């Protein structure tokens, strides 16, 4: 126990933000615990193409993104979802922080197949010491689903891509991937618990589809590379666990 969690809050999961999530934060951030939040926002980057007149493809659960599209995607990430999150913790006492020109200097990334997905990033590393000066302040990190090429260009990075990064690269306690449903469903219910060696083969007979690919994929991940526990469900401490074994 490094006392180390890091929360992934998915788009519809950011705009239903409960009583008891609030004060779990606070609780944690009172009892010492360091936090760290990512968030993504492909509900409200839809919604913004649909009003500014751009055809939403996906592939492989991953958004096809060219560059004048990435000026929609900023725009949703930081201004539409990232605030919102910042202004409810901080009326419930927490203290953190948004960042904006500090994210190129924490995510570093690279196109993912250009000719493919565009503007689609792949996490390269994460820059641990600017995200231990927040926590050495006792402040959240909040970071949107954004990173930056060697040359300097923002890149669209999957929310689940980065909070397997991020876990990593801390050597987080437990991962938490916050959504708009109670589990991973098979056959009609919420499935208790799963390991990294079984979630290959319900992407193969297809249990698993759309966003929740990239999701199971980064909770494999993370565990795989020793992080104890990740939880996938619509709230801060139920839902399916994953395990590596
Ligand atoms: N086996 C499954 N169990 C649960 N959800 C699934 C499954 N297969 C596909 N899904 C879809 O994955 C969605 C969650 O992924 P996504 O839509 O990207 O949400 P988020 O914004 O939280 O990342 C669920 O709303 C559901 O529609
Ligand atoms: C929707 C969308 O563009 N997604 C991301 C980023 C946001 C999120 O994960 O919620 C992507 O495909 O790369
Ligand atoms: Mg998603």
């Known amino acids: 126990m490094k006392d180390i969690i890091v929360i992934k809050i998915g788009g519809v999961a950011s705009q239903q933000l409960s009583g008891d999530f ?4 606070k609780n944690w ?4 615990k360091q936090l760290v939040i990512v968030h993504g926002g492909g509900f409200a980057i839809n919604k913004l193409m649909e009003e500014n007149q751009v055809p939403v493809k996906k592939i492989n659960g991953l958004r096809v993104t060219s560059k004048d599209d990435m000026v929609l995607v900023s725009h949703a990430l930081l201004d539409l979802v990232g605030k919102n999150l910042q202004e409810k913790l901080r009326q419930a006492g927490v203290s953190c922080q948004q960042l904006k020109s500090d994210i190129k200097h924490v995510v570093a990334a690279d196109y993912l197949d ?5 503007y689609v990033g792949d996490v390269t590393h994460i820059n641990k010491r600017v995200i231990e000066e927040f926590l050495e302040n006792r402040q959240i990190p909040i970071l949107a ?7 300097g260009d923002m890149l669209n990075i999957n929310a689940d891509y980065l909070a397997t990064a991020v876990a990593v690269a801390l050597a987080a306690d437990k991962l938490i991937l916050m959504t708009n449903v109670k589990g991973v469903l098979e056959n009609g ?4 618990k ?21 999701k199971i994929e980064s909770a494999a991940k993370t565990v795989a590379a020793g992080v104890g526990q990740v939880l996938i469900g619509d709230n801060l401490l139920t839902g399916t666990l994953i395990t590596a074994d």
């Open 189 to 192: 219910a919420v499935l208790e």
């Open 22 to 25: 609030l004060s779990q934060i």
């Open 145 to 151: 689903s954004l990173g930056y090429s060697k040359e």
């Open 114 to 118: 250009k000719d493919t997905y565009g």
């Open 29 to 32: 951030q009172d009892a010492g």
């Open 194 to 214: 799963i390991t990294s060696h079984q979630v290959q083969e319900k992407i193969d007979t297809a249990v698993i589809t759309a966003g929740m690919i990239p």
